[PDB]
């Protein structure tokens, strides 16, 4: 009937190993991975890469995901992957007792399955280009502790590929990647992107901690309020909102005597506007601090904070490899900055734009001009050409274009003591000297047609004195996207939220 | 009006007046300004001349032609003395400065004969000049002197209500203990992050706007997300597992979570900062448990060392006394069954053997176990493992040869839960089985389930209450003392 032959070969493909002491292959439960009633010294590819670029003397155990597997008759080639490390492993069954069933079982493993391999490492004449570990494991044993259960939504070979203008080049589009984000995050570049994101949080916090800041956590469930862009929730039959920013609370912390504070936390913004550059939820980096007599003391401090961030991102083996891996798939010129950061007034920036023919305004209607986002990018091109930098500062915005807490110039009330920082022509930071006089604050709140009653907890925090202070807010994802030159904010947010995407 | 003009005197030139309210712009000669933290750290050499120093007027007293000002900044105070010069108009202006005003004082530093017991800067300043850059506009809601005192529960004594403090949090936070508490909160965050980063973790940030609850829809806040039905995250549980499923191997998050518990208790809030860890293990999830244990031991060690942290803990204990937090060199680990049998042996519970795994230990019972283990093991810190499967969430992996027990754990400080975690189910078929066994909607969770379907590493994780860890470390009586602007069902403001 020739059916028994198929059922037997199926038992081979599904083989469960009951004793890794007496067998060389199979699916195995984690609790059975004991060799001689003892525990296995198990390596990952990261350790292997550091030591090699003792475990060359004899057989070792190594764990990883099956990135790729190529069957070639009596040979089979496995690429193992861990993070951004990979290594070719070789099963040569003319070297394993002509166990053809073991080869049948190995060839049948689906991509991404997790295996523990026992084998010998050695260096080959011509190492594989794709693998950054230049040794190979010769497989003595291979057991699968987790088998892929389902066809992948797309192949990693395709998702890892640079921009495709070539014949037969398959792209994986944004919607597909984000709907299958846990597969998309396995590309080398995406892995590197979020290691770099972590790296920015780390450098940010450590710089501020070294300058005597304390970290704060302030609430995101608010009771009142730019109400236009605020998500609403029912807070126990009370009318509540999600924080668009920790603004009010970080200031209240300075009014309490904390002197220097920072927060790393989500904020929530209901901008019904699908763009490549904003999200409805993002991680905000917030700083608030006192100054002595000049708010430029703090500006120059914020500036050296970003020069330190850029310097650390661009220094050392680890950060060098992460950036290179991103650039392999998403090429872009290295981010440039100067020893002295260029600073331009809003008024100077306009005149540069009028002078380069990018902007036309009647000599009356200059103060009221609200520079567009496209125009800010035109300004960046100009400053890149004339100052050879991707990073500069704009100060002294018109008070009418800034929020109500922004201190204006005493002797020129239409100008404010405010500032934006730019990376590749796009805003990464916004801040200002604060109004720290209760009566001025009350006046400016009235002058903005705002309800002082819904702000009195905040207003009242200024009524028992208030140090001179300033602050800024920073988009983490935006800093990472613009440092690397990526085309979309969704590339630097783990599970992006926009007005059409609530899932994953 | 003549005496009023002198009390409201605005100084238009600092070089030649010596007193008055002055704007920040009219303050150049620019001075070299000091704060009391720089003073304190350099003394406990600027003592050779007149220095400028800014601070708040913590206390002021007019001993005839003498004026005593206690200047305050953060945790540091120093006594400053005015004794006219014979410029009586200046003594009038100073004596009327309301408390909490911010002044720039210029003068000389001298060792005092009798060091003031109150000021931890055991020097004094002699005032050559004093200006007020910020004048208290309003009468405080209570006095800092009363806010700083230990609460004597007797008739007619001072007591600043919790409600009064929280309604006026920006004054409340100026007490020496409250400032110290939140410095210690930053310290925990720092020790936690740095320990993980040194162990090769990466920081992740995952969304708090969801289409489905992460810890059960009964206690989740509802949100209108552009005409979708949404919820606030109760924990990053689903996303931190997805990141392990994506290969990140070791992740942590420090981020708010939101829980709509309609109970007003002393130990829980509706918003708190969750410290979350998720990581792979090789063969045995106890590898990660021991690692979590060693993280907390490191935190306790670093919090308890000499220097700044001892000063901070000491400042807190001055107003809120409590014995130092203790832990052993080797942490005690009890199974859930053993913990229950300790409670039975001490007459706190009457349970037959076959009823033990069905008992769900209450908060009071856990405090009772805390007292038992404190008397017998001499520690404030222990671990319980092997909780009943039916009492833990659906992502908890059960013991294969003993399914009614799970591979789960809580950590405790002073008998109260600070951490909860478990080995995760890392098999997509077993996960679907457990989702159904817990009568849950696999369709709502599909994005999460699916992340296990292209292989899943053995992993575990845990979630930690930042505010509760600080509260229990210091022995404080209410979670609202370790959250800056606490949220409970009755308080949305500040
Ligand atoms: N929808 C968004 N999506 C993404 Cl991804 N990033 C966004 C979005 N919106 C903003 N950012 C980023 O956050 C930055 C700060 O925000 S802000 O509005 O300009 N001013 C602050 O709130 C203000 N309180 C700061 C202060 O004065 O201390 C900004 O520079 C961008 O980089
Ligand atoms: N209302 C509250 N207020 C305040 Cl202030 N703190 C609270 C509140 N609720 C809880 N905590 C604290 O957070 C801890 C973890 O929370 S959890 O529910 O037990 N388990 C996790 O969610 C689970 N996904 C973790 C995992 O398996 O990795 C807990 O130990 C407490 O310390």
Author numbering:
A (entry chain A): 97 to 149, 179 to 350, 353 to 631
B (entry chain B): 103 to 131, 135 to 149, 179 to 218, 222 to 631
Please give sentences taken from the publication describing this entry.
Protein translation relies on aminoacyl-tRNA synthetases (aaRSs) to charge tRNAs with their cognate amino acids. Plasmodium AspRS is a Class IIb aaRS that exhibits unusual sequence features compared with human AspRS, including initiation from an internal methionine, and an insert in the anticodon-binding domain. PvAspRS (96–631) was successfully crystallized as the apo protein, in complex with the natural intermediate, and with synthetic Asp-AMS and Asp-DACM, allowing insights into the binding determinants. As anticipated, PvAspRS adopts a dimeric structure with features typical of Type II aaRSs.
We solved the structure of PvAspRS with bound synthetic Asp-DACM and refined it to 2.4 Å resolution. Well-defined electron density was observed for the adduct in both chains A and B. The Asp-DACM is located in the active site pocket of the catalytic domain and interacts with a number of amino acid residues. The adenine moiety is stacked between H405 and Y409 from motif II. H405 moves from its position in the apo protein to form a parallel π stack with the adenine ring. In both chains, R396 extends to interact with the aspartate of Asp-DACM. Similarly, E398 repositions to form an H-bond with the adenine. The aspartic acid moiety of Asp-DACM also interacts with Q374, R561, and K377. Residue E352 (of the SEGG motif in Chain B) repositions to interact with the amino group of the aspartate, leading to a small movement towards the ligand. In Chain A of Asp-DACM-bound PvAspRS, two additional residues of the flipping loop (G353 and G354) are resolved compared with the apo protein.
